[PDB]
Q: What sequence folds into this?
């Protein structure tokens, strides 16, 4: 149902841009630390933001600090950990905080199960936990049942499924509310939201962008709620280049 995106918006239109990172602005890698956004693409994003009053943000499941490393030397408004971390246009950061006992008890729980799930990696994010299983796809059903049971015993936590990852996040955190928080703040407010993403976490953003009369763009294959689709990360780059230089 999603329509192939072919038109590039004009550089000085009234758009507010929201970009996912992994699988959208950067190609998918076997390991997250090999992921890179080419410096040419970062310059296009920075020029696009500059012509749109700074209304451009990165909306990612990665931690805020990892986004700053990937976007170096540029510093954009950010949503990290699916919205549990956020940095507005004023550089002000907002952090969702979990009870210290919850973080300690859950991490100890998840770590003890890894001996029976070899190849899985537990990434601790301060207020969230990510279970990476790209090196062992067989563990996916177990990690889902395990994380689902974590969210039942600790109702402060919610489930976030993703590409080769099962993520445990604070309840009420999602990229839709992250985009919402931005859309009521000075630079983004009064513009039309454009959100480009590729994973299940991005579907929540697609929903609020569609309801807002904005432009939602799915990257890659799979069922989507987005109205528009790009076929691959290099197609995002080419779309980005055509906005900057028609
Ligand atoms: C060798 C053949 C290639 C197959 C590789 C398949 C692996 C896909 C994949 C695996 C793990 C990913 O996790 C990373 O990115 C997440 C999403 O970030 S996001 O897309 O900007 O929302 C973050 O949440 C995580 O912290 C970060 O470690 C992201 C993508
Ligand atoms: Mg994503």
A:
């Amino acid at each position: 149902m999603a329509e192939p995106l072919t038109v590039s918006p004009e550089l000085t239109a009234n758009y507010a841009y929201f970009f996912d990172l992994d699988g959208t602005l950067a190609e998918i890698k076997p390991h997250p630390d090999q992921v890179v956004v080419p410096h040419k693409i970062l310059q296009l994003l920075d020029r696009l933001a500059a012509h749109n009053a700074g209304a451009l943000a990165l909306i990612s499941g990665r931690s805020m600090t990892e986004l700053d490393a990937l976007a170096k030397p540029f510093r954009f408004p950010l949503a990290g950990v699916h919205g549990a971390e956020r940095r507005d246009i004023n550089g002000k950061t907002h952090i969702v905080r979990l009870p210290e006992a919850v973080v300690r008890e859950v991490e100890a729980l998840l770590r003890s199960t890894l001996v029976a799930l070899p190849g899985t990696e537990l990434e601790s994010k301060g207020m969230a936990f990510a279970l990476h299983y790209r090196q062992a796809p067989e563990h996916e059903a177990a990690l889902l049942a395990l994380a689902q049971h974590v969210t039942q015993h600790w109702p402060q936590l919610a489930l976030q499924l993703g590409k080769c990852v099962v993520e445990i996040k604070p309840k009420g955190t999602n990229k839709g509310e992250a985009i919402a928080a931005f859309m009521q703040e000075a630079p983004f407010a009064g513009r039309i939201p454009v959100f480009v993403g590729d994973d299940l976490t991005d579907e929540a953003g697609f929903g609020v962008v569609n309801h807002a009369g904005g432009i939602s763009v799915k990257v890659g294959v799979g069922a989507t709620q987005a109205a528009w689709r790009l076929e691959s990360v290099p197609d995002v780059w080419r779309w980005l280049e055509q906005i900057n230089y028609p």
Q: What stands out?
A: Residues 1-95+173-246 form one domain. The CA atoms of residues 14 and 119 lie 46 Å apart.
